[PDB]
Amino acid sequence: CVLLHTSRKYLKLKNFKDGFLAQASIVLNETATSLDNVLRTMLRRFADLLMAMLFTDAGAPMRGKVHLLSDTIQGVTATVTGVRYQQSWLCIICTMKALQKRHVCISRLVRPQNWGENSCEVRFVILVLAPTAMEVARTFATMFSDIAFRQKLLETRTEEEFKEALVHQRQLLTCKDFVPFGKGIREDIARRFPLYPLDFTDGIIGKNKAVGKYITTTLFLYFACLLPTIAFGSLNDENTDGAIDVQKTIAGQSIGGLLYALFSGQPLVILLTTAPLALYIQVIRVICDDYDLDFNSFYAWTGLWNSFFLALYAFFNLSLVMSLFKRSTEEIIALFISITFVLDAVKGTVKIFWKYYYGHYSGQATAVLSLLIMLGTLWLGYTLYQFKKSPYLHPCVREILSDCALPIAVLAFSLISSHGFREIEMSKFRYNPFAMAQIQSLSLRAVSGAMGLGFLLSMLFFIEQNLVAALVNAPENRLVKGTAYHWDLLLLAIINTGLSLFGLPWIHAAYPHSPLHVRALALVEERVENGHIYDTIVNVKETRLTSLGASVLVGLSLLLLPVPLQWIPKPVLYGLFLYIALTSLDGNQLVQRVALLLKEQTAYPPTHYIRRVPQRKIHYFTGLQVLQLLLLCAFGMSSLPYMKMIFPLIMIAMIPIRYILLPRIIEAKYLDVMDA
Amino acid sequence: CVLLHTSRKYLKLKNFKDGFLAQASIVLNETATSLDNVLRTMLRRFADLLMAMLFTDAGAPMRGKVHLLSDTIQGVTATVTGVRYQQSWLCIICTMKALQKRHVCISRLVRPQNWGENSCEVRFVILVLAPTAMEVARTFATMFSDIAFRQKLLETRTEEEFKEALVHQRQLLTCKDFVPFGKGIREDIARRFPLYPLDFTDGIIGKNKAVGKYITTTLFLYFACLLPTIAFGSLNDENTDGAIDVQKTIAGQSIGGLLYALFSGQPLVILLTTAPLALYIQVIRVICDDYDLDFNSFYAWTGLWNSFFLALYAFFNLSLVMSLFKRSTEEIIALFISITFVLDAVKGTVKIFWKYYYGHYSGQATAVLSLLIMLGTLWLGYTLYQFKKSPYLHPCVREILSDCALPIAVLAFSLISSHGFREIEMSKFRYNPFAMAQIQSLSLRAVSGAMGLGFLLSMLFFIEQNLVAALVNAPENRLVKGTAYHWDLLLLAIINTGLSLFGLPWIHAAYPHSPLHVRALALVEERVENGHIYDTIVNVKETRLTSLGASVLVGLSLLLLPVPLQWIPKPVLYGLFLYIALTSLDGNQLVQRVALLLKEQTAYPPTHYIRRVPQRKIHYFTGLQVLQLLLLCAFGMSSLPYMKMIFPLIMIAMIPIRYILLPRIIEAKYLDVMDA
């Protein structure tokens, strides 16, 4: 072995408040795969024994030794996760006494190439030869450290355009809030009204064409909204004894998505039915059965009261308090939703076994095949989804696999269970081939009960919709257009009134699908941390065409319901539920901290928040979060409808708990470190 | 973000051909988890505002910035895989003008702690403060760069012992080969005879006690030899129409393992039946059925001829030519073995479906449950095995998971399929509760045929045994005791004669279990490359107690045949075959190159052999290897016994092909880079 001396030092960003800009040599579309070839081409561009000195193996270039660059500059940032390097660019420096004049070469690679640790996705290489080099390297790093400038340089097609862009960039671098009634809605409408044409003409016309990306994301959204829509329709049909069918769920989802895409601010939010909504509909069905009330009328009245409360919240600008919402409560809610998905799948398979395996109406074969198909669908979907994080696959391959993991698994296992195992008939969701509910035919006592239930549902809707909207409107997503929280809530209430009046299932912003929609509709910079791909969004196109097309396709899918879309057996839908439950915990810090018990604290990056905070306080915070999650499960997943209807109240209550009690029992600094 | 300047430079290993050795301060068993605490303790040991200067965030220690060490020294080596850092130690340097005298502090951590990017498993921290620092840091790095010296320092218990060890280490650092008949056997016996007591008294007595490690590895070996032994016994019973039972396979494996452990050199090699051996036994059964020859007599004669040829090879010292063996041929053979395992599992499940699902004697339920159990066993075993590579799990946790993955999966799914699904009876391996074969009652023509078949089997045995022995005797394993190839081959021939005379299935060195046995019986230094744990063996204990105990336990397991060990259904054994097939390709470079078509070449480390070699030549080599593998599969996996009996010949032929033809069509430099 050979000893290596690594020296790290800061460099102040150049303060612009040039000759080498014009004298720089630009290489575009470099197809070389190795560092040696790229550097040889870059050096030849100047006009060789000069490439050898660039690395540590200076003096013994023939013998096989460690081949590492000597002087490099990169962008670095500090975060709770650790030290994140800007791996999209690299600046190599070489001070050669033989040379007489400074030389600068900027090379843009066709594809991102690993160029070392913390440079796994280099696309720009800035080689600076000096006869100092420090000043030129610092100024070029300062110019290249901008996230948008790198994308602008990527968009350039010619060397002259590259130099002009560089010159242009250098020159350029040189309480009581709720008192106003309806202020938030008016502000959101004013913000997002003038941008409507823009929203509809972002990628269709202009310098950048997004037709292919728009089509691909439209297909993604259509599939990822239809398949969960079918699963939720089947679940509701099982829960409501056929009151809400799969056809009703599909129609409601299509209408709601179309209305939201057409007439909402922040169109990137996707409306879909959720597991807690199914649980609450089950609560309504149980209450109606107990009190002999018509399901349709009671459901319509509950939806009407929920929409009324949501409109009251929107008009009074309550959404602002959602700024106090922290990540811990969000992750607790997400884990509860995943647990509800898992329990729905388990209940479905248990019912299948009870009806078929135990003969409580060849049933054993059907039950075993159902279990096998559900587990296999889950496994295949999870594997195809996790292939997205592989840093060695082509970007196209690992974005198609992410895009078409669940659809591929569903199709493959539907074929397996309907053609490979056609001799074993199994369960399929009901389909009997939209009348307004008789709201007037209901007692006043039932109206008051619906009022209370709608209040609880409105709290649930407020929390969920604002959570997903905040996720979509995160600062790291780089959304130029303004936010629309109150107008979005009002439109959600309106469309929910419309859906409830016709008995269609409720819908709100979908947590798993909205960030996925944003990512599919965004340009990202690949980052490799611990052998996994992480995406840094640079530009989101922010168009309504994708959501509108997805909604229209989902609506048109009603014609494929009888003959197609029914060969998908119920176990495939349960596997879809399991896949959603597992894949909704990708960035869950609560799950990470829970697993930390089985992991090693000292194995995390030196600057990771886990290592920074004492393990005792981390465990205390995890225990408090787990206690909150257990209490949420206890109320919101019991057999008692009267106590299953209360879980929105405790969802509201956790926010005051996190805001008040936890800082009193846990130090504020540690909570700030963990949450951020 | 803040620009970072990384400077890399060589440092010549100190040439010893001291005061600071005695003046150094030693800290032992440091339980601190963060860098700040460790460095604070180390600085306090001298007797604070000095810890801040050690990192790049000098001048702004309060504001949250990137917290990286400034001057660090590490051990680095170059390999075809890439640049491998010595992550077990780190030397931090700080030149402070305030200080008046040099200071050195050596801290040993209780557990390996990530301390960087290429410092994921640091256990020794050498902090050098200077008022130069370069000389002291270089000499300490040179002393610590030794792999065995780090283990010796770990073994020390007190500061005085640590200093004495440091001082002692510093002082210390200051053709025609086959003509002799039987020379190899005599040399091996002379080498390995005096070390017998040592072999039996390595960890039992002395400074280091290995009782716990010996017990754990004995349990691992027992389970990993019994379960595949049962699977192979069932496969042979299916193939040979009950001629070779599971009881016979267990007895033969136990006797052979005991004999090999007792009276062989290099006892770390594990003898077990293999898939090609099962295929060849099937060939023998088919030939006997075709020619109406007694299976036992023909099998015994074939084994006798195979042993005679193996003894001839051992006495004439042919094993030496195995040095010409390359990694490409080894990996082709391993992939062929895995494919044979997969086809055996597929044939078993196809037969189960044909008998039960199609009723060609509730069968559909049994077939579907068989498929589900096999797939689930494969999945669980693979997951528990792959958890071994997680860099965040505790070393004990991942070591146990690797040790008890297959046994845990087998037990869990046997319980599931025998208790959870007890209503669905399914296939179980035959067991009817050891007579010498009537060799004298066989025709001369059958004797000549058995001679030819035994010649082919002897070539197969030579290749397989020498391959596994070379894997066990790899230089990187650090085996102090000498190698024994010819004596091992002679003993293998003797025990094979003994086994064949009684009709027991043949056995030779097991490729998947011998390296695993070595690893379980070895101390390793953890390395994290691309987020995966890689082990560097420092010391292998090299004892026969583990293999002897495993063989004795396997033999004693015959008493657990009737009531235990039969609830394991055949699909569990097929899942075991699949698990072995998938887990035998961990380091397969042929599989890596085949998958490279779907991967990105530029995403590999800069110094990886994949990027160094042009992709065209990599693809040509992969295509040639795949063609050889396809020919091997075609000959050794067809329905014709006369052509299924020839695959050992082409296994032999592939070595001349690799040695002669490939260098002619592919450049020698690229082949050397890829193979090494």
Author numbering:
A (entry chain A), B (entry chain B): 105 to 121, 131 to 160, 173 to 256, 264 to 306, 336 to 522, 569 to 640, 645 to 887
The paper states:
To further explore how PIP2 participates in the complete substrate transport process of BTR1 and prove the connection between PIP2 and pH sensing, we attempted to solve the structures of BTR1 with the R125H mutation or wild-type BTR1 prepared under acidic pH, which may both disrupt the interaction between BTR1 and PIP2, and succeed in achieving resolutions of 2.96 Å and 2.94 Å, respectively. Intriguingly, two structures are nearly indistinguishable in conformation (RMSD = 0.250 Å), and both lack the densities of PIP2. These results suggest that the disruption of PIP2 binding site and acidic pH can both lead to the dissociation of PIP2. Non-PIP2 binding BTR1 occupies a 3D space of ~100 Å × 55 Å × 85 Å. Compared with the structures of BTR1 in the outward-facing state, the distinct features of the non-PIP2 binding BTR1 structures involve that the NTD has undergone a significant twist, as well as an apparent conformational change has taken place in the TMD. Analysis of the TMDs using HOLE2 shows that the substrate binding sites of BTR1 in these two states are accessible from the intracellular side, suggesting their inward-facing conformation. Disruption of the PIP2 binding sites (BTR1IF/R125H state) or acidic pH (BTR1IF/5.5 state) both turn BTR1 into the inward-facing conformation. Protonation of PIP2 under acidic pathological condition or pathogenic mutations exist in the L site of BTR1 lead to the disruption of the interaction between PIP2 and BTR1. Thus, we hypothesize that PIP2 molecules participate in the pH sensing process of BTR1 through passively changing their binding affinity with BTR1 under alkaline or acidic pH. Here we suggest that PIP2 may participate in sensing the intracellular pH by changing its affinity to BTR1.
BTR1 (SLC4A11) is a NH3 stimulated H+ (OH-) transporter belonging to the SLC4 family. Dysfunction of BTR1 leads to diseases such as congenital hereditary endothelial dystrophy (CHED) and Fuchs endothelial corneal dystrophy (FECD). BTR1 shares a similar membrane topology with other SLC4 family members, with its substrate binding sites located in the central cavity between the gate and core domains. The TMD contains a core domain (comprising TMs 1–4 and 8–11) and a gate domain (comprising TMs 5–7 and 12–14), resembling the arrangement of UraA25.
